[PDB]
């Protein structure tokens, strides 16, 4: 059980290089199961979620190695099941289903269960596949999919907006007979990156990043080389790190058009922001941030993966600000932890109401969330005294070596093995 011991207060300033998007890497690694010649994915972050993906790929029969880049040879894939033991540790494994059924006509993936952040059903994944001609049944907890021959292009109108299901259907359709059209598709940058990787292998896709995606089936996909886009969530997290510590920062290897909503909100909090073509700068000019009001929603609105960080900002800001969550309505476990550190907040239904205090106090807190818990580490950096963040293996799934980057910004942080 690793822990972070953090010493503050400390003013975070300097620069940071952004790693590749964790949530682009993942879908792409699973899309590689479609490829019949070898592919190299560049700029992949070193995260536990990538490790788990590789472990699953390999288990399926693919040939996988890695450093900066990941290498995948999916020619000899010969087992078609993502077993309970893996899926339970990372529900994104469900992404194996699509490609497996599209290419080999069969696929067995464990049905994911409960998550601490809220209800997370996969009905849209299943329904999308059935609509593409797959037959799907559930036995022994496995969703078992099969198709005689290959899938058939279809006009699919999505009941609600879903990143996961949009990816599942998009990927499966690349090897179907004819044209698939996805209506009400998710527009997340990562879905664009995934589509562009697919095209690189010889797929025919258009409309990615808009609500309508068109896929023209081809008979087989090849190999190639593709570089993953920068991680907007990591970028946001560090921008926020500076904004709460009254610091200044430059983020290198960024993609600004990816963060419109976040940057706009940071300006409202009083930050001075400039952007280049692959950098973002933020300066607080020694100022304490002003409270803001936020509502999470699918891209390009403000992202749920940034919600906890902005909650922290508000909790040390001037005034009162609320944050409403419309994507994961129970994603507030960070709030009671920040309360142990002297933050003043209440939760009414799916809105947190924050009353900013001048400074927080060090305490023992517990991580539980892949992305959200990073806010506990950030809190540690600006709190008065010593904070111990327990159970950071969660954070290790989500960020590449966060302590190294924070230290290079002035943080007093240490990883211990209690
Ligand atoms: C928490 C993850 O980030 C999440 C990110 O929060 C969400 C939204 O941004 O989109 C991905 O999740 P996801 O695919 O599960 O999210 P979505 O499917 O868009 O969620 C849609 C919403 O509709 C619901 N939903 C989803 C699928 C479905 O079949 N039915 C359904 O009702 C879910 O409850 C959810 O509340 C990212 N996960 C990955 C691996 O990319 C992470 O960082 O690991
Ligand atoms: O359920 P898994 O995303 O921790």
Short mmCIF file of C-alpha atoms and ligand atoms in Angstrom, two decimals:
data_model
loop_
_atom_site.label_atom_id
_atom_site.label_comp_id
_atom_site.label_asym_id
_atom_site.label_seq_id
_atom_site.Cartn_x
_atom_site.Cartn_y
_atom_site.Cartn_z
CA UNK A 1 0.00 0.00 0.00
CA UNK A 2 1.95 2.97 -1.33
CA UNK A 3 1.14 6.46 0.00
CA UNK A 4 2.06 10.03 -0.86
CA UNK A 5 3.40 12.17 1.93
CA UNK A 6 3.01 15.83 1.03
CA UNK A 7 4.39 18.96 2.73
CA UNK A 8 2.91 22.41 2.24
CA UNK A 9 2.09 25.10 1.63
CA UNK A 10 4.08 25.23 -1.59
CA UNK A 11 3.69 27.40 -4.68
CA UNK A 12 3.62 25.38 -7.89
CA UNK A 13 5.35 27.08 -10.79
CA UNK A 14 7.56 26.27 -13.77
CA UNK A 15 6.67 23.98 -16.66
CA UNK A 16 5.43 20.47 -17.42
CA UNK A 17 5.34 18.20 -20.46
CA UNK A 18 1.96 16.63 -21.19
CA UNK A 19 1.81 12.86 -21.68
CA UNK A 20 -0.35 11.05 -24.25
CA UNK A 21 -4.08 10.74 -23.57
CA UNK A 22 -4.80 7.71 -21.38
CA UNK A 23 -8.31 7.66 -22.79
CA UNK A 24 -7.10 7.66 -26.39
CA UNK A 25 -4.43 5.03 -25.79
CA UNK A 26 -6.99 2.61 -24.33
CA UNK A 27 -9.55 2.56 -27.16
CA UNK A 28 -6.77 2.47 -29.73
CA UNK A 29 -5.03 -0.52 -28.10
CA UNK A 30 -8.34 -2.40 -28.31
CA UNK A 31 -9.02 -1.25 -31.84
CA UNK A 32 -5.68 -2.89 -32.73
CA UNK A 33 -7.41 -6.27 -32.38
CA UNK A 34 -8.86 -5.46 -35.81
CA UNK A 35 -5.45 -5.11 -37.41
CA UNK A 36 -3.96 -7.91 -39.56
CA UNK A 37 -0.51 -6.39 -39.68
CA UNK A 38 1.53 -4.94 -36.90
CA UNK A 39 0.91 -1.57 -35.46
CA UNK A 40 2.96 0.82 -33.39
CA UNK A 41 1.23 3.30 -31.12
CA UNK A 42 3.43 6.25 -30.14
CA UNK A 43 3.33 8.65 -27.18
CA UNK A 44 1.56 6.23 -24.86
CA UNK A 45 1.57 7.19 -21.17
CA UNK A 46 3.04 4.82 -18.65
CA UNK A 47 -0.07 4.04 -16.65
CA UNK A 48 -1.44 0.96 -14.97
CA UNK A 49 -4.51 1.10 -17.26
CA UNK A 50 -2.21 0.63 -20.26
CA UNK A 51 -0.52 -2.30 -18.47
CA UNK A 52 -3.89 -3.94 -17.84
CA UNK A 53 -4.82 -3.44 -21.50
CA UNK A 54 -1.60 -5.04 -22.69
CA UNK A 55 -2.09 -7.92 -20.30
CA UNK A 56 -5.53 -8.51 -21.82
CA UNK A 57 -4.32 -8.19 -25.44
CA UNK A 58 -1.53 -10.67 -24.81
CA UNK A 59 -3.93 -13.05 -23.08
CA UNK A 60 -6.07 -12.94 -26.26
CA UNK A 61 -3.08 -14.06 -28.31
CA UNK A 62 -1.60 -10.76 -29.47
CA UNK A 63 2.11 -9.97 -29.35
CA UNK A 64 2.72 -6.99 -27.16
CA UNK A 65 5.72 -5.06 -25.93
CA UNK A 66 6.57 -1.48 -24.96
CA UNK A 67 9.16 0.94 -23.56
CA UNK A 68 7.71 5.12 -25.31
CA UNK A 69 5.58 3.33 -27.82
CA UNK A 70 3.51 0.23 -27.63
CA UNK A 71 3.90 -2.53 -30.23
CA UNK A 72 1.02 -4.81 -31.13
CA UNK A 73 0.93 -7.86 -33.42
CA UNK A 74 -2.65 -9.11 -33.58
CA UNK A 75 -2.33 -11.65 -36.38
CA UNK A 76 -2.30 -14.74 -34.13
CA UNK A 77 -5.23 -13.80 -31.88
CA UNK A 78 -6.89 -17.12 -31.08
CA UNK A 79 -8.75 -16.70 -27.81
CA UNK A 80 -11.84 -14.53 -27.66
CA UNK A 81 -12.73 -13.94 -24.02
CA UNK A 82 -12.06 -11.14 -21.55
CA UNK A 83 -12.32 -13.03 -18.22
CA UNK A 84 -13.97 -11.80 -15.00
CA UNK A 85 -10.60 -11.36 -13.20
CA UNK A 86 -9.48 -8.67 -15.67
CA UNK A 87 -12.73 -6.84 -16.38
CA UNK A 88 -13.30 -6.39 -12.65
CA UNK A 89 -10.01 -4.47 -12.38
CA UNK A 90 -10.78 -2.22 -15.39
CA UNK A 91 -14.28 -1.98 -16.91
CA UNK A 92 -12.87 -0.49 -20.13
CA UNK A 93 -11.93 -4.10 -21.03
CA UNK A 94 -15.50 -4.27 -22.35
CA UNK A 95 -13.99 -2.61 -25.44
CA UNK A 96 -12.63 -5.97 -26.54
CA UNK A 97 -16.14 -7.18 -27.43
CA UNK A 98 -16.65 -5.10 -30.54
CA UNK A 99 -13.44 -5.87 -32.47
CA UNK A 100 -13.55 -9.56 -31.57
CA UNK A 101 -17.08 -10.02 -32.99
CA UNK A 102 -16.33 -7.86 -36.01
CA UNK A 103 -13.22 -9.83 -36.99
CA UNK A 104 -13.66 -13.39 -35.71
CA UNK A 105 -17.46 -13.52 -35.47
CA UNK A 106 -17.43 -14.31 -31.77
CA UNK A 107 -16.60 -12.59 -28.48
CA UNK A 108 -17.11 -13.20 -24.75
CA UNK A 109 -16.68 -10.33 -22.31
CA UNK A 110 -17.52 -10.32 -18.60
CA UNK A 111 -20.47 -7.99 -17.77
CA UNK A 112 -19.07 -5.19 -15.54
CA UNK A 113 -20.60 -4.68 -12.13
CA UNK A 114 -20.83 -1.81 -9.67
CA UNK A 115 -18.59 1.23 -9.69
CA UNK A 116 -18.13 3.61 -6.78
CA UNK A 117 -18.92 6.70 -8.92
CA UNK A 118 -22.45 5.66 -9.95
CA UNK A 119 -24.64 3.60 -12.28
CA UNK A 120 -22.63 2.43 -15.31
CA UNK A 121 -24.76 0.07 -17.49
CA UNK A 122 -23.53 -0.99 -20.94
CA UNK A 123 -26.94 -1.48 -22.59
CA UNK A 124 -25.97 0.89 -25.41
CA UNK A 125 -22.91 -1.22 -26.30
CA UNK A 126 -25.00 -4.38 -26.49
CA UNK A 127 -27.89 -2.77 -28.33
CA UNK A 128 -25.55 -1.18 -30.88
CA UNK A 129 -23.99 -4.58 -31.65
CA UNK A 130 -27.37 -6.31 -31.98
CA UNK A 131 -28.39 -3.57 -34.35
CA UNK A 132 -25.30 -4.40 -36.43
CA UNK A 133 -26.58 -8.00 -36.73
CA UNK A 134 -24.89 -9.63 -33.72
CA UNK A 135 -26.68 -12.15 -31.55
CA UNK A 136 -26.06 -11.51 -27.85
CA UNK A 137 -26.75 -13.64 -24.77
CA UNK A 138 -25.71 -13.54 -21.14
CA UNK A 139 -24.52 -16.70 -19.39
CA UNK A 140 -22.32 -17.16 -16.29
CA UNK A 141 -22.01 -13.38 -16.20
CA UNK A 142 -20.46 -13.20 -19.67
CA UNK A 143 -21.97 -11.26 -22.52
CA UNK A 144 -21.50 -13.70 -25.38
CA UNK A 145 -21.77 -12.25 -28.90
CA UNK A 146 -21.79 -14.08 -32.22
CA UNK A 147 -22.46 -13.49 -35.90
CA UNK A 148 -22.74 -15.88 -38.87
CA UNK A 149 -20.31 -14.24 -41.29
CA UNK A 150 -19.82 -10.51 -40.80
CA UNK A 151 -21.81 -7.62 -39.37
CA UNK A 152 -24.07 -5.41 -41.48
CA UNK A 153 -23.98 -1.62 -41.64
CA UNK A 154 -27.03 0.04 -40.06
CA UNK A 155 -28.54 3.37 -39.15
CA UNK A 156 -28.13 3.56 -35.38
CA UNK A 157 -29.63 6.39 -33.34
CA UNK A 158 -28.14 6.53 -29.85
CA UNK A 159 -30.57 6.91 -26.97
CA UNK A 160 -28.09 8.92 -24.98
CA UNK A 161 -24.59 10.27 -25.40
CA UNK A 162 -21.93 7.69 -24.58
CA UNK A 163 -18.19 7.69 -25.19
CA UNK A 164 -17.87 3.94 -24.65
CA UNK A 165 -20.71 2.83 -26.89
CA UNK A 166 -19.80 5.28 -29.62
CA UNK A 167 -16.35 3.70 -29.72
CA UNK A 168 -17.71 0.12 -29.61
CA UNK A 169 -20.04 0.63 -32.55
CA UNK A 170 -17.64 2.74 -34.59
CA UNK A 171 -14.94 0.08 -34.30
CA UNK A 172 -17.17 -2.91 -35.03
CA UNK A 173 -18.62 -1.22 -38.11
CA UNK A 174 -15.24 -0.81 -39.84
CA UNK A 175 -15.44 -4.50 -40.85
CA UNK A 176 -19.17 -4.71 -41.59
CA UNK A 177 -20.99 -5.05 -44.90
CA UNK A 178 -21.96 -1.62 -46.14
CA UNK A 179 -22.54 1.69 -44.40
CA UNK A 180 -23.16 2.39 -40.73
CA UNK A 181 -24.42 5.73 -39.50
CA UNK A 182 -24.23 6.66 -35.82
CA UNK A 183 -26.62 9.43 -34.80
CA UNK A 184 -26.20 11.38 -31.57
CA UNK A 185 -22.58 10.21 -31.31
CA UNK A 186 -20.18 11.38 -28.59
CA UNK A 187 -17.79 14.09 -29.82
CA UNK A 188 -14.91 13.57 -27.35
CA UNK A 189 -11.42 14.34 -28.82
CA UNK A 190 -10.41 10.77 -27.98
CA UNK A 191 -13.13 9.44 -30.29
CA UNK A 192 -11.62 11.56 -33.05
CA UNK A 193 -8.15 10.16 -32.33
CA UNK A 194 -9.53 6.62 -32.39
CA UNK A 195 -11.24 7.25 -35.73
CA UNK A 196 -8.04 8.70 -37.21
CA UNK A 197 -6.07 5.63 -36.08
CA UNK A 198 -8.70 3.40 -37.70
CA UNK A 199 -8.50 5.34 -40.97
CA UNK A 200 -4.73 4.91 -40.87
CA UNK A 201 -5.26 1.12 -40.91
CA UNK A 202 -7.47 1.49 -43.98
CA UNK A 203 -10.90 2.15 -42.47
CA UNK A 204 -13.35 4.60 -44.03
CA UNK A 205 -14.77 6.98 -41.43
CA UNK A 206 -16.20 10.48 -41.61
CA UNK A 207 -17.92 12.86 -39.22
CA UNK A 208 -15.82 12.09 -36.11
CA UNK A 209 -16.09 14.92 -33.58
CA UNK A 210 -19.63 15.66 -34.75
CA UNK A 211 -22.92 14.08 -33.70
CA UNK A 212 -23.01 11.99 -36.89
CA UNK A 213 -20.40 9.36 -37.73
CA UNK A 214 -20.36 7.50 -41.06
CA UNK A 215 -18.49 4.22 -41.47
CA UNK A 216 -18.02 2.44 -44.78
CA UNK A 217 -17.16 -1.19 -44.18
CA UNK A 218 -14.01 -2.67 -45.67
CA UNK A 219 -13.01 -6.32 -45.77
CA UNK A 220 -9.84 -6.13 -43.74
CA UNK A 221 -7.60 -3.68 -41.91
CA UNK A 222 -3.81 -3.47 -42.02
CA UNK A 223 -1.10 -2.11 -39.77
CA UNK A 224 0.79 1.15 -39.35
CA UNK A 225 2.09 3.83 -37.01
CA UNK A 226 0.03 6.39 -35.06
CA UNK A 227 0.77 9.00 -32.39
CA UNK A 228 -1.79 9.55 -29.59
CA UNK A 229 -2.96 13.11 -28.87
CA UNK A 230 -2.10 14.96 -25.62
CA UNK A 231 -4.10 14.28 -22.45
CA UNK A 232 -6.52 17.18 -21.80
CA UNK A 233 -7.31 15.95 -18.30
CA UNK A 234 -3.65 15.90 -17.26
CA UNK A 235 -3.29 19.33 -18.83
CA UNK A 236 -6.26 20.66 -16.90
CA UNK A 237 -5.02 19.16 -13.66
CA UNK A 238 -1.70 21.00 -13.81
CA UNK A 239 -3.29 24.29 -14.95
CA UNK A 240 -5.48 24.00 -11.86
CA UNK A 241 -2.42 23.14 -9.74
CA UNK A 242 -0.95 26.51 -10.66
CA UNK A 243 -4.23 28.44 -10.30
CA UNK A 244 -4.80 27.29 -6.69
CA UNK A 245 -1.22 27.84 -5.52
CA UNK A 246 -1.15 31.39 -6.89
CA UNK A 247 1.56 30.23 -9.26
CA UNK A 248 2.36 30.30 -13.00
CA UNK A 249 2.94 27.46 -15.45
CA UNK A 250 3.60 26.46 -19.05
CA UNK A 251 2.29 23.16 -20.38
CA UNK A 252 4.28 21.71 -23.25
CA UNK A 253 3.01 19.20 -25.84
CA UNK A 254 -0.58 20.39 -25.39
CA UNK A 255 -3.56 20.69 -27.70
CA UNK A 256 -5.49 23.83 -26.67
CA UNK A 257 -8.53 23.38 -28.97
CA UNK A 258 -9.23 20.44 -26.67
CA UNK A 259 -9.85 22.49 -23.54
CA UNK A 260 -12.14 25.40 -24.51
CA UNK A 261 -14.59 25.00 -21.65
CA UNK A 262 -11.84 24.48 -19.00
CA UNK A 263 -9.77 27.48 -20.10
CA UNK A 264 -12.86 29.69 -20.16
CA UNK A 265 -13.68 28.69 -16.60
CA UNK A 266 -10.11 29.35 -15.45
CA UNK A 267 -10.34 32.90 -16.84
CA UNK A 268 -13.58 33.39 -14.88
CA UNK A 269 -11.62 32.29 -11.81
CA UNK A 270 -9.20 35.12 -12.62
CA UNK A 271 -6.36 33.42 -14.46
CA UNK A 272 -4.25 35.01 -17.22
CA UNK A 273 -4.07 32.47 -20.03
CA UNK A 274 -2.27 32.37 -23.35
CA UNK A 275 -2.10 29.55 -25.89
CA UNK A 276 0.32 28.59 -28.64
CA UNK A 277 -0.12 25.78 -31.13
CA UNK A 278 1.16 23.19 -28.67
CA UNK A 279 1.44 25.02 -25.36
CA UNK A 280 -0.71 26.68 -22.72
CA UNK A 281 0.44 29.28 -20.21
CA UNK A 282 -1.34 30.35 -17.04
CA UNK A 283 -0.42 33.15 -14.63
CA UNK A 284 -2.28 34.06 -11.45
CA UNK A 285 -0.12 37.14 -10.80
CA UNK A 286 -0.01 36.23 -7.08
CA UNK A 287 -3.81 36.37 -6.93
CA UNK A 288 -6.19 34.02 -5.12
CA UNK A 289 -8.77 32.50 -7.55
CA UNK A 290 -12.40 33.72 -7.75
CA UNK A 291 -15.28 31.25 -7.17
CA UNK A 292 -16.90 29.84 -10.31
CA UNK A 293 -20.06 27.89 -11.25
CA UNK A 294 -19.75 24.74 -13.32
CA UNK A 295 -22.01 22.17 -14.96
CA UNK A 296 -20.49 18.92 -16.29
CA UNK A 297 -21.69 17.47 -19.59
CA UNK A 298 -20.42 15.62 -22.67
CA UNK A 299 -17.73 17.27 -24.80
CA UNK A 300 -17.19 20.02 -25.70
CA UNK A 301 -18.84 21.13 -22.45
CA UNK A 302 -16.92 21.03 -19.14
CA UNK A 303 -15.72 17.43 -18.50
CA UNK A 304 -16.61 15.32 -15.45
CA UNK A 305 -12.94 14.22 -15.30
CA UNK A 306 -12.08 17.80 -14.27
CA UNK A 307 -14.91 18.22 -11.78
CA UNK A 308 -13.04 17.31 -8.56
CA UNK A 309 -10.15 19.55 -9.44
CA UNK A 310 -12.46 22.55 -9.91
CA UNK A 311 -14.20 21.64 -6.69
CA UNK A 312 -10.84 22.10 -4.97
CA UNK A 313 -10.28 25.40 -6.73
CA UNK A 314 -13.65 26.65 -5.48
CA UNK A 315 -12.90 25.41 -1.95
CA UNK A 316 -9.88 27.73 -1.67
CA UNK A 317 -11.36 30.54 -3.75
CA UNK A 318 -12.90 33.92 -2.95
CA UNK A 319 -16.66 33.50 -2.54
CA UNK A 320 -19.26 30.81 -3.09
CA UNK A 321 -19.46 28.60 -6.16
CA UNK A 322 -21.42 25.53 -7.12
CA UNK A 323 -20.60 22.52 -9.26
CA UNK A 324 -23.33 20.41 -10.83
CA UNK A 325 -22.61 16.96 -12.21
CA UNK A 326 -24.86 15.64 -14.94
CA UNK A 327 -22.71 12.77 -16.17
CA UNK A 328 -21.85 10.80 -13.00
CA UNK A 329 -24.32 12.00 -10.40
CA UNK A 330 -22.60 10.36 -7.38
CA UNK A 331 -19.02 11.38 -8.12
CA UNK A 332 -18.34 13.38 -4.96
CA UNK A 333 -16.22 11.20 -2.64
CA UNK A 334 -13.41 13.75 -2.86
CA UNK A 335 -15.66 16.26 -1.04
CA UNK A 336 -15.73 14.61 2.43
CA UNK A 337 -11.95 14.04 2.20
CA UNK A 338 -11.33 17.70 1.43
CA UNK A 339 -13.55 18.39 4.42
CA UNK A 340 -11.04 16.58 6.63
CA UNK A 341 -8.61 19.24 5.43
CA UNK A 342 -10.87 22.07 6.53
CA UNK A 343 -12.87 22.73 3.33
CA UNK A 344 -16.44 24.02 3.66
CA UNK A 345 -18.91 22.32 1.36
CA UNK A 346 -22.37 20.84 1.20
CA UNK A 347 -23.82 18.38 -1.29
CA UNK A 348 -27.43 18.88 -2.37
CA UNK A 349 -28.46 16.06 -4.65
CA UNK A 350 -26.01 16.29 -7.57
CA UNK A 351 -24.60 19.76 -6.86
CA UNK A 352 -21.80 20.62 -4.47
CA UNK A 353 -22.01 24.07 -2.92
CA UNK A 354 -18.59 25.44 -2.00
CA UNK A 355 -17.62 28.24 0.37
CA UNK A 356 -13.98 29.14 -0.21
CA UNK A 357 -11.54 29.26 2.67
CA UNK A 358 -8.21 31.09 2.82
CA UNK A 359 -6.09 27.96 3.49
CA UNK A 360 -6.47 24.20 4.12
CA UNK A 361 -4.86 22.03 6.81
CA UNK A 362 -2.90 18.78 6.30
CA UNK A 363 -4.58 15.48 7.20
CA UNK A 364 -4.81 11.81 6.28
CA UNK A 365 -7.02 11.27 3.24
CA UNK A 366 -7.99 8.34 1.07
CA UNK A 367 -7.89 8.12 -2.72
CA UNK A 368 -10.66 6.15 -4.50
CA UNK A 369 -10.87 7.60 -7.97
CA UNK A 370 -8.71 7.14 -11.03
CA UNK A 371 -8.84 10.82 -11.96
CA UNK A 372 -10.77 12.64 -9.26
CA UNK A 373 -8.41 11.74 -6.39
CA UNK A 374 -5.59 13.71 -7.98
CA UNK A 375 -7.34 16.59 -6.31
CA UNK A 376 -6.30 15.20 -2.91
CA UNK A 377 -2.66 15.31 -3.96
CA UNK A 378 -3.13 18.85 -5.23
CA UNK A 379 -4.81 19.80 -1.94
CA UNK A 380 -1.76 18.39 -0.13
CA UNK A 381 0.56 20.72 -2.01
CA UNK A 382 -1.24 23.88 -0.85
CA UNK A 383 -2.42 22.82 2.61
CA UNK A 384 -0.72 23.88 5.83
CA UNK A 385 1.53 21.10 7.06
CA UNK A 386 1.57 17.38 6.28
CA UNK A 387 -0.95 15.43 4.22
CA UNK A 388 -0.82 11.69 3.72
CA UNK A 389 -2.75 10.43 0.70
CA UNK A 390 -3.45 6.74 1.23
CA UNK A 391 -4.13 4.13 -1.44
CA UNK A 392 -2.57 5.95 -4.44
CA UNK A 393 -2.63 2.90 -6.66
CA UNK A 394 -5.86 4.46 -7.99
CA UNK A 395 -3.91 7.53 -9.07
CA UNK A 396 -1.25 5.29 -10.67
CA UNK A 397 -3.94 3.99 -13.07
CA UNK A 398 -4.67 7.55 -14.21
CA UNK A 399 -1.51 9.70 -14.28
CA UNK A 400 2.04 9.02 -15.50
CA UNK A 401 4.37 9.63 -12.55
CA UNK A 402 2.47 12.54 -11.03
CA UNK A 403 4.94 13.06 -8.17
CA UNK A 404 7.85 13.69 -10.52
CA UNK A 405 5.98 16.37 -12.44
CA UNK A 406 4.68 18.00 -9.26
CA UNK A 407 8.14 18.02 -7.69
CA UNK A 408 9.55 19.69 -10.78
CA UNK A 409 7.02 22.46 -10.07
CA UNK A 410 8.20 22.93 -6.48
CA UNK A 411 6.13 20.32 -4.65
CA UNK A 412 7.42 18.64 -1.52
CA UNK A 413 6.16 15.14 -2.17
CA UNK A 414 7.33 11.62 -1.38
CA UNK A 415 6.19 8.11 -2.20
CA UNK A 416 6.41 5.75 0.81
CA UNK A 417 5.69 2.01 1.27
CA UNK A 418 3.87 1.90 4.64
C1 LIG B 1 -13.56 7.57 -15.64
C2 LIG B 1 -12.93 7.30 -16.98
O1 LIG B 1 -13.29 8.32 -17.89
C3 LIG B 1 -14.49 8.05 -18.56
C4 LIG B 1 -15.18 9.34 -18.75
O2 LIG B 1 -15.45 9.79 -17.46
C5 LIG B 1 -16.46 9.04 -19.46
C6 LIG B 1 -17.13 10.35 -19.64
O3 LIG B 1 -16.06 11.23 -19.84
O4 LIG B 1 -16.19 8.50 -20.73
C7 LIG B 1 -15.53 7.28 -20.63
O5 LIG B 1 -16.30 6.53 -19.77
P1 LIG B 1 -17.53 5.84 -20.32
O6 LIG B 1 -17.30 5.34 -21.65
O7 LIG B 1 -17.86 4.88 -19.30
O8 LIG B 1 -18.58 7.03 -20.33
P2 LIG B 1 -19.91 7.15 -21.13
O9 LIG B 1 -20.30 5.88 -21.66
O10 LIG B 1 -19.87 8.32 -21.97
O11 LIG B 1 -20.93 7.50 -20.02
C8 LIG B 1 -22.24 7.81 -20.43
C9 LIG B 1 -23.25 7.92 -19.31
O12 LIG B 1 -24.35 7.20 -19.77
C10 LIG B 1 -24.51 5.99 -19.06
N1 LIG B 1 -24.43 4.85 -19.94
C11 LIG B 1 -23.34 4.49 -20.55
C12 LIG B 1 -23.37 3.39 -21.36
C13 LIG B 1 -24.53 2.67 -21.53
O13 LIG B 1 -24.58 1.68 -22.25
N2 LIG B 1 -25.62 3.05 -20.91
C14 LIG B 1 -25.58 4.12 -20.13
O14 LIG B 1 -26.59 4.48 -19.56
C15 LIG B 1 -23.42 5.91 -18.03
O15 LIG B 1 -24.00 5.73 -16.76
C16 LIG B 1 -22.81 7.27 -18.02
O16 LIG B 1 -23.37 7.93 -16.91
C17 LIG B 1 -14.22 7.52 -19.93
N3 LIG B 1 -13.62 6.25 -19.65
C18 LIG B 1 -12.67 5.83 -20.43
C19 LIG B 1 -12.02 4.54 -20.12
O17 LIG B 1 -12.35 6.47 -21.38
C20 LIG B 1 -11.43 7.16 -16.86
O18 LIG B 1 -10.73 8.16 -16.91
O19 LIG B 1 -10.90 6.06 -16.73
O1 LIG B 2 -14.62 -0.16 -12.47
P1 LIG B 2 -13.21 0.24 -12.86
O2 LIG B 2 -13.27 1.40 -13.83
O3 LIG B 2 -12.46 0.66 -11.62
#
